[PDB]
Write a protein that binds this ligand. Structure first.
Ligand code: THG
Ligand code: CL
Ligand code: CL
Ligand code: CL
Ligand code: MG
Ligand code: MG
Ligand code: MG
Ligand code: MG
Length: 162
């Protein structure tokens, strides 16, 4: 099964973790917990922004060009990315914008962090029809000395497809 995992500011703005305007170690812990021991698929912009393979996960980079780093697995299409994951229970797509857009139709689960921040970025999470999904978990957390903004984790499971 394919899942997307994303952190969304107001207006469903996303960007690279290393440059986003919030500081949420709690969200990074959520991301790690929900991706550990699963393959992660990302585009090249996200890969370059991380710069080092995420530990304890197979890192698959979706790029139309030949790879530039032997520490990760380079693939040229959505289908090839999925094939490279082999037989695993759950494949995690970690962005960015265009990669989420291409994988959303193949996804059956979303892990979202709804962050109470308004920001300047121009990359967005894909449009999804909320009527097609069921919320099976949600937890709000206020900001604290370690986390700059309040945020709400959510897991959604797909019920319909258009
Ligand atoms: N929900 C959540 N989803 C996301 C992001 C996020 O921001 N949070 N941002 C994008 C993914 N980018 C990264 C980049 C780096 C890390 C990262 O570095 N993670 C460490 C945890 C951080 C740490 O404590 O060292 C890890 O091992 O997973 C996580 C997501 C897309 N989806
Ligand atoms: Cl968590
Ligand atoms: Cl990307
Ligand atoms: Cl505190
Ligand atoms: Mg090589
Ligand atoms: Mg889009
Ligand atoms: Mg769309
Ligand atoms: Mg229904």
């Amino acid at each position: 099964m394919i899942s997307l995992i994303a952190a969304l500011a107001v207006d469903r703005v996303i960007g690279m973790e290393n440059a986003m305007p919030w500081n949420l170690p709690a969200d990074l812990a959520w991301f790690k917990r929900n991706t550990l021991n699963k393959p992660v698929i990302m585009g090249r912009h996200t890969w370059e922004s991380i710069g080092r393979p995420l530990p304890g996960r197979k890192n698959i980079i979706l790029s139309s060009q030949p790879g530039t780093d032997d520490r990760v697995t380079w693939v040229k299409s959505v289908d090839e990315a999925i094939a490279a994951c082999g037989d695993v229970p759950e494949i995690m797509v970690i962005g960015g914008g265009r990669v989420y857009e291409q994988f959303l139709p193949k996804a059956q689960k979303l892990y979202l962090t709804h962050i109470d921040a308004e920001v300047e970025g121009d990359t967005h999470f894909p449009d999804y029809e909320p009527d097609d999904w069921e919320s099976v978990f949600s937890e709000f957390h206020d900001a604290d000395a370690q986390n700059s903004h309040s945020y709400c984790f959510e897991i959604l499971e797909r019920r319909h497809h258009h």
